[PDB]
């Protein structure tokens, strides 16, 4: 159904002005007018492909007077020819007719066998041309200019084309739907493993991201590891003979973010934050809790998933990951067995899938290496409550389209490691956080003025890149991402990119980038980082806070209040930058009673299934509503942002909230509750 002969239909008599490129599954090579105005008249056509059958055959068409046909460079129409089973023969057909009186083309290709049965050639017999960068049994190729052999004529790639689905196939036509342009000299304009033609005609792995079906958007995996929770325990040692002692482990939830530190690194990394909120009774040190003496060792287990935030899937190799304490203390290497993956790792997805159990670093597996820390490393983890996961870019084999059989299959001859460098060298990179404040990278084909091949690509503007790579749209004068104007996001660039864009702005006599996005041209190797302006970002470009005015405004909508808590509607992005809340009762003279007065007791908010947030005053008040002794006392509630969050007791041991920088978000007298 994606298989057959490939046809080019031209409005002129001499194969210069292709109006339609499309394939036919059978010898019926017609395009009726209903699938198509002054240029619906076709004066020439070329069809290309292969035939596979053992007999003497006679070829004929419905217009033999206007046709030349070759079977492997032997002219068969301008004859019984012998064809053998199990063999592939090249087919080329040319058709020319001056001043046709009907629109479209009625054209059929027949053959007659030695029992004199004549019929339109069936689908089982016809195959597409080998539109690849190398020949396979099937070579590549009255020549349509097609310098890169992807199947799209030079002129269309340069001038602009559209693809439309008509019944059961794709018509590729000149632009007068999405307007495509691509390099006529790059089989894959994004330097990825899928051709410009494969992409736009759907002859491609169904798991490739929708946006990466544009020839100007790169299709490649981007993988990091998400750690969901951790369990720490004292290692057994040769000196301790008895193993029957009580459970003394520390179990914590963890939050992991993919990071970016703009920059030039194509490295994968994620940073893990270990929850500091109360989980065990007492206020013990981690050593005290687990009974670690100064000569003991501890180990760590965790649950993880791999995340693919890129645009193409992985099939047979997961990348290797280092788990790192502090700057460079590697605690573990995490690997998966090659060629034994339980599933695909698709774009915008996880491995294992979220409907399945995550992976335990030490699986309930005789050979799993313990993830051990010495005593000083353990104390460092307790202090920092951070780990890092550095993942390589080793992604294995690629599922490619095969023109012989019209199937996509993992090709042991094709490997992501042969493609990534060229993608990185020839594209502009944009990292955007508009999807839930998580950093998502895309790469867009962009000219490199210094590399002659890369100058054969279309100009990529900043506006178009944002539209095609991230789905920005323009409904009514103004570029937007899911309702949010582009002006709600900032632009940051690496040093070279910044100078380039500065010089462009100067050349345009433009002082504001947001009003000339359609005029700013991207170049290969640019790095652009675009972040939601509402937020404060750490050195990893993780959102960790927001200005007080933003935070206050975000808590203005109170549904209900009582001595039990607050019920509010709070934007999802704002919730992401808080560690918790502090509740206080303020008496008439201005003295304050802090109710949950501990750095590990701020986790009092929860998101209900109706999407509203409840801030629970009872949780750390011994399960009791607030006692307000005089109705003129105030109940004050403060938000604590991540960047302001205390994760350890103070140097002198104080576990209270004294001196924590907090933002007042609710204040009402007792009689107002």
By the rule CB under 5 A, 275 interacts with Ca ion = no
Query: In the stretch 483-522, what mask flags binding to Ca ion with x, by CB under 5 A?
Result: ----------------------------------------
Q: Residue 494 and residue 306: Cα distance in Å, rounded? A: 28
Q: Residue 470 Cβ, how far from Ca ion at the closest point, in Å?
A: 23
Residue 450, annotated as binding a ligand: no
Question: What b-and-e string marks burial along 156-192, b requiring 16 or more CB atoms within 10 Å of the CB?
Answer: bbeeebbbeeeeebbbbbbeeeeebbbbbbbbbbbbb
Helix or strand or coil: residue 47?
Answer: strand
CB-based burial label for 193 (10 Å; 0-12, 13-18, 19+) = buried
Q: Residue 390 Cβ, how far from Ca ion at the closest point, in Å?
A: 35
Q: Residue 18 Cβ, how far from Ca ion at the closest point, in Å?
A: 11
Residue 577 in tokens: 């930058």
* Count of residues that interact with Ca ion, criterion CB under 5 A: 7
Q: What is the 3-state secondary structure (H, E, C) of 445-475?
A: ECECCCCCHHHHCCCCEHHHHHHHHHCCECC
Residue 304 or 445 having the CB closest to Ca ion: 445
Q: Which residues pair with 641 in a beta bridge?
A: 578
By the rule CB under 5 A, 182 interacts with Ca ion = yes
Residue 35 in tokens: 């699938």
Residue 135 or 482 having the CB closest to Ca ion: 135
Residue 152, annotated as binding a ligand: yes
Residue 150 or 390 having the CB closest to Ca ion: 150
Q: Residue 546 and residue 566: Cα distance in Å, rounded? A: 21
Q: Among all residues, whose Cβ is closest to Ca ion? A: 196
Q: Residue 500 Cβ, how far from Ca ion at the closest point, in Å?
A: 26
Identify which of 105, 117, 214, 111 has the alpha carbon closest to the alpha carbon of residue 162: 214
Long-range contacts of 121-124 (CB under 8 A, 24+ apart): 121/26, 121/27, 121/51, 122/26, 122/27, 123/3, 123/4, 123/25, 123/26
Are 52 and 138 in contact by the 8 Å Cβ rule? The answer is no
Q: Residue 155 Cβ, how far from Ca ion at the closest point, in Å?
A: 10
Residue 564, annotated as binding a ligand: no
Phi and psi, residue 288, nearest 5°: -55, -45
Helix or strand or coil: residue 238?
Answer: coil
Residue 146 or 464 having the CB closest to Ca ion: 146
Q: Residue 421 and residue 611: Cα distance in Å, rounded? A: 44
Residue 153 or 319 having the CB closest to Ca ion: 153
Are 469 and 444 in contact by the 8 Å Cβ rule? The answer is yes
Segment near Ca ion (CB under 5 A), from 104-112, 145-153, 549-557, 663-671? 145-153
Query: In the stretch 521-560, what mask flags binding to Ca ion with x, by CB under 5 A?
Result: ----------------------------------------
Radius of gyration for the alpha carbons in the chain, expressed in angstroms and rounded = 32
Q: Residue 455 Cβ, how far from Ca ion at the closest point, in Å?
A: 14
Query: In the stretch 431-450, what mask flags binding to Ca ion with x, by CB under 5 A?
Result: --------------------
By the rule CB under 5 A, 150 interacts with Ca ion = yes
Identify which of 450, 410, 413, 396 has the alpha carbon closest to the alpha carbon of residue 133: 413
Q: Across the beta sheet with 489-493, what order do the strands follow?
A: 440-445, 427-432, 527-532, 489-493
Question: Looking only at residues 151 through 170 of this chain, which bind Ca ion when binding is defined by CB under 5 A?
Answer: 152
Residue 436 or 459 having the CB closest to Ca ion: 459
Question: Looking only at residues 187 through 246 of this chain, which bind Ca ion when binding is defined by CB under 5 A?
Answer: 196
Q: Residue 95 Cβ, how far from Ca ion at the closest point, in Å?
A: 21
Q: What is the 3-state secondary structure (H, E, C) of 128-171?
A: CCCCCCCCCCCCCCCCCCCCCCCCCCHHHHHHCEEEEEECCEEE
Residue 83 or 152 having the CB closest to Ca ion: 152
Is the previous residue joined to 107 through a cis bond, with omega within 30 degrees of 0?
Answer: no
Segment near Ca ion (CB under 5 A), from 146-154, 274-282, 303-311, 511-519? 146-154
Q: Residue 157 Cβ, how far from Ca ion at the closest point, in Å?
A: 5
By the rule CB under 5 A, 454 interacts with Ca ion = no
> 10 Å Cβ neighbour count for 520?
19
Cα distances (Å, whole numbers) of residue 179 to 158, 162, 461, 561: 11, 5, 14, 54
Residue 7 or 545 having the CB closest to Ca ion: 7
Residue 150 or 211 having the CB closest to Ca ion: 150
Residue 502, annotated as binding a ligand: no
Residue 135 or 496 having the CB closest to Ca ion: 135
Residue 218 or 637 having the CB closest to Ca ion: 218
Q: Residue 400 Cβ, how far from Ca ion at the closest point, in Å?
A: 16
Residue 186, annotated as binding a ligand: yes
Segment near Ca ion (CB under 5 A), from 174-182, 241-249, 475-483, 604-612? 174-182
Residue 616, annotated as binding a ligand: no
Residue 150 or 382 having the CB closest to Ca ion: 150
Q: Residue 456 Cβ, how far from Ca ion at the closest point, in Å?
A: 9
Residues 6 or more apart whose Cβ sits within 8 Å of residue 81: 56, 57, 58, 59, 71, 74
Residue 10 in tokens: 């031209």
Given 148, 192, 532, 600, the residue binding Ca ion (CB under 5 A):
148
Q: Residue 79 Cβ, how far from Ca ion at the closest point, in Å?
A: 33
Given 19, 23, 146, 620, the residue binding Ca ion (CB under 5 A):
146
Q: Residue 188 Cβ, how far from Ca ion at the closest point, in Å?
A: 7
Bind-site residues = 146, 148, 150, 152, 157, 183, 186, 196
Bind-site residues for Ca(2+) = 146, 148, 150, 152, 157, 183, 186, 196
Q: Which residues bind Ca ion (CB under 5 A)?
A: 146, 148, 150, 152, 182, 186, 196
């Amino acid at each position: 159904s994606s298989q057959g002969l490939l046809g080019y239909y031209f409005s002129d008599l001499n194969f210069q002005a292709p109006m339609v490129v499309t394939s036919s599954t059978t010898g019926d090579l017609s395009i009726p007018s209903s699938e198509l105005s002054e240029n619906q008249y076709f004066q020439s056509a070329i069809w290309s492909g292969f035939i596979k059958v053992s007999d003497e055959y006679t070829f004929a068409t419905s217009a033999d007077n206007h046709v030349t046909m070759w079977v492997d460079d032997q002219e068969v129409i301008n004859n019984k020819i012998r064809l053998e089973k199990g063999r592939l023969y090249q087919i080329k057909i040319q058709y020319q007719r001056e001043n046709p009186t009907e629109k479209g083309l009625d054209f059929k290709l027949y053959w007659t066998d030695s029992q004199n049965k004549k019929e339109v050639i069936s689908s089982d017999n016809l195959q597409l041309p080998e539109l690849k960068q190398k020949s396979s049994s099937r070579k590549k190729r009255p020549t349509v200019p097609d310098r890169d052999n992807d199947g799209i004529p030079d002129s269309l790639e340069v001038e602009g084309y559209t693809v439309d689905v008509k019944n059961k196939r794709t018509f590729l036509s000149p632009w007068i739907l999405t307007k495509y342009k691509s390099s006529p000299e790059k089989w894959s304009t994004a330097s990825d493993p899928y051709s410009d033609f494969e992409k736009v005609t759907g002859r491609i792995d169904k798991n490739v991201s929708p946006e990466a079906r544009h020839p100007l958007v790169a299709a490649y995996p981007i993988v990091h590891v998400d750690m969901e929770n951790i369990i720490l325990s004292k290692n057994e040692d040769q000196s301790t003979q008895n193993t029957d002692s009580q459970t003394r482990t520390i179990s914590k939830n963890t939050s992991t973010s993919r990071t970016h530190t703009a920059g030039f690194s194509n490295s994968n990394s994620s940073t893990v934050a270990i929850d500091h909120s109360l989980s065990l009774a007492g206020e013990r040190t981690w050593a005290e809790t687990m009974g670690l003496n100064t000569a003991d060792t501890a180990r760590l287990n965790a649950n993880i998933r791999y995340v693919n935030t890129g645009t193409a899937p992985i099939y047979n190799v997961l990348p290797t990951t280092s788990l790192v304490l502090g700057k460079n203390q590697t605690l573990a290497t995490i690997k998966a067995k090659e060629n034994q993956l339980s599933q695909i790792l698709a774009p915008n997805n996880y491995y294992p899938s979220k409907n399945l159990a995550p992976i335990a670093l030490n699986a309930q597996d005789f050979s799993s290496t313990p993830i051990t820390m010495n005593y000083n490393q353990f104390l460092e983890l307790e202090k920092t409550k951070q780990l890092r996961l550095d993942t390589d870019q080793v992604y294995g084999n690629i599922a490619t389209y095969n023109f012989e059989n019209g199937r996509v299959r993992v090709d042991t001859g094709s490997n992501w490691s042969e493609v990534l460098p060229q993608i990185q060298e020839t594209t502009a990179r944009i990292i955007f956080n508009g999807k839930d404040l998580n950093l998502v990278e895309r790469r867009i084909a962009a000219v490199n003025p210094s590399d002659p091949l890369e100058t054969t690509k279309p100009d990529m503007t900043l506006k178009e890149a944002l539209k095609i790579a991230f789905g920005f749209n323009e409904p009514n004068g103004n570029l937007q991402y899911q309702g949010k104007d582009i002006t709600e996001f900032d632009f940051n660039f690496d040093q070279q990119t910044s100078q380039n864009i500065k010089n462009q702005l100067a050349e345009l006599n433009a002082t504001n980038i947001y009003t000339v996005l359609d005029k700013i041209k991207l170049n290969a190797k640019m790095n652009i980082l675009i972040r939601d302006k509402r937020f404060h970002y750490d050195r990893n470009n993780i959102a960790v806070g927001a200005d007080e005015s933003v935070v206050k405004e975000a808590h203005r909508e109170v549904i209900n209040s009582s001595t039990e808590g607050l019920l509010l509607n709070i934007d999802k992005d704002i919730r992401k930058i808080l560690s918790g809340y502090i509740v206080e009762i303020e008496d008439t003279e201005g003295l304050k009673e802090v109710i949950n007065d501990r750095y590990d007791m701020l986790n009092i908010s929860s998101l209900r299934q109706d999407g509203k947030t409840f801030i629970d005053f009872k949780k750390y008040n011994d399960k009791l509503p607030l006692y307000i002794s005089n109705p003129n006392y105030k109940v004050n509630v403060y938000a604590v942002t991540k960047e302001n969050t205390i994760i350890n007791p103070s140097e002198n041991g104080d576990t209270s909230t004294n001196g924590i920088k907090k933002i007042l978000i609710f204040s009402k007298k007792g009689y107002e509750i």
